[PDB]
Amino acid sequence: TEVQLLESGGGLVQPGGSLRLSCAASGFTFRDYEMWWVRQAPGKGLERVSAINPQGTRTYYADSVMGRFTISRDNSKNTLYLQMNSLRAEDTAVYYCAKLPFTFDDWGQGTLVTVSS
Amino acid sequence: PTACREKQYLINSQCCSLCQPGQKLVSDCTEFTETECLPCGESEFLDTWNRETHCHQHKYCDPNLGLRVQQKGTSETDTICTCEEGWHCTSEACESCVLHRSCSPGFGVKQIATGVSDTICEPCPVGFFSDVSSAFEKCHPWTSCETKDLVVQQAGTDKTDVVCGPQD
């Protein structure tokens, strides 16, 4: 397992806030693989948030996050991103980034997101 | 001589009876004796009516691979594995765990949400194609060369939007 994905830029934020998750990939031809953002919370147990194609032309979003969240990538910088704006309590979760097969090797270490008041 | 019934196997002129599932071969039947078969350990199993002399060891679902045991393996049945919950089994053989399946080139998508753990794929309709394996993307329509160009070969499901050209 030589695939390494490093999550960055999580944290606590007030409702209506913004956060830009950064998933720094290494160990594979990032430019060739379709990518995902998934969130996991106790009780809310796993939810597929967003998806992006290798080029960045096509994207997928869960209805829940649509219009507020934004998937992106810089293939020359080999980093995956999530611009999460207009944040709500429901988004409180541990967010993870993927790699097309979607096996155990293919996963980022995660980053925690919490809202409160 | 020859022919031999199903559940028989034949060897050096005699029509011998095969070992039943969960039993290994020890001796070929003679003119006076029936085929000597013996059971497998509750580690080992045997799939079919056989003439195999060594039982196959059970599957082993490694939790550190997201695998759990669905069906416990018997002396005549291999251990049937299953993926965690949010994930589906990478193949019919429950061997690896994937978050979700990826809809191979000639197919589009209809989405994953668990325990509906797979992505429900659609064969490309006429006039549509999909290249690449994608967990989210749908089939896309062919490009109309027509716009100051002429179609030289066509696409269809797998193949990229009608290559071209030109001619007109």
Interface check for B135 against chain A (CB to CB < 8 A): the answer is yes
A-facing residues of B in 90-129 (CB < 8 A) are 90, 96-100, 102, 112-114
> Do the Cβ atoms of B135 and A102 come within 8 Å?
yes
**B50: which residues sit within 8 A by CB, 6+ positions away?**
B18, B19, B21, B24, B25
Do B9 and B75 reside in the same domain of the chain? Answer: yes
The structure tokens listed for A112 are 């925690």
**Alpha-carbon span A52 to A81, nearest angstrom:** 10
B40/B55 Cα distance (integer angstroms) = 6
Contact B13, B30 (CB under 8 A): no
Considering the domain architecture, whether residues B166 and B91 belong to the same structural domain is answered as yes
Q: Are residues B80 and B101 in the same domain?
A: no
> Do residues A8 and A111 make contact, with C-beta atoms less than 8 angstroms apart?
yes
Task: Supply the range of the domain harboring residue B63.
Answer: 1-84
CATH number for the domain formed by residue range(s) A1-117: 2.60.40.10
DSSP per-residue codes, B93-129:
S--SEESS----TTEEE----SSS-S--EEEPPTTEE
A and B: number of Cβ contacts within 8 A: 52
End-of-domain residue from the set B54, B84, B114: B84
The tokens for A29 are 């031809």
Is any Cβ of chain A less than 8 angstroms from the Cβ of B134? yes
Q: Are residues B52 and B116 in the same domain?
A: no
- B93 and B158 co-located in one domain: yes
Q: Do A58 and B96 touch (CB under 8 A)?
A: no
Q: Verify that B95 and B167 share a domain, yes or no.
A: yes
Of A48, A54, A58, the CB nearest to B112: A48
Which of B65, B84, B103 finishes a domain? B84
Of B84, B108, B140, which residue is a domain's last?
A: B84
Q: Are residues B111 and B69 in the same domain?
A: no
Residue B164 makes CB contacts below 8 A (sequence gap 6+) with B145, B149, B150, B151, B152, B153
* Same domain as B138, residue B77: no
Contacts for B39 with CB less than 8 Å, ≥ 6 apart: B22, B23, B24, B75
What residues of chain A, 2 to 21, have a C-beta less than 8 Å from chain B?
none
Identify the DSSP state of A89: G
Number of domains in chain B: 2
**For chain A, how are helix, strand and coil distributed in percent, rounded to 5?**
5, 45, 50
Q: Which residues contact B168 (CB under 8 A, 6 or more apart)?
A: B149, B150
Resolution in A: 3.3
Q: Residue A71 in 3-state DSSP? A: strand
Q: A 62-101 residues with CB below 8 A of B?
A: 98, 100-101
Question: Which domain CATH number covers B129?
Answer: 2.10.50.10
Same domain as B78, residue B31: yes
Elucidation technique: X-ray
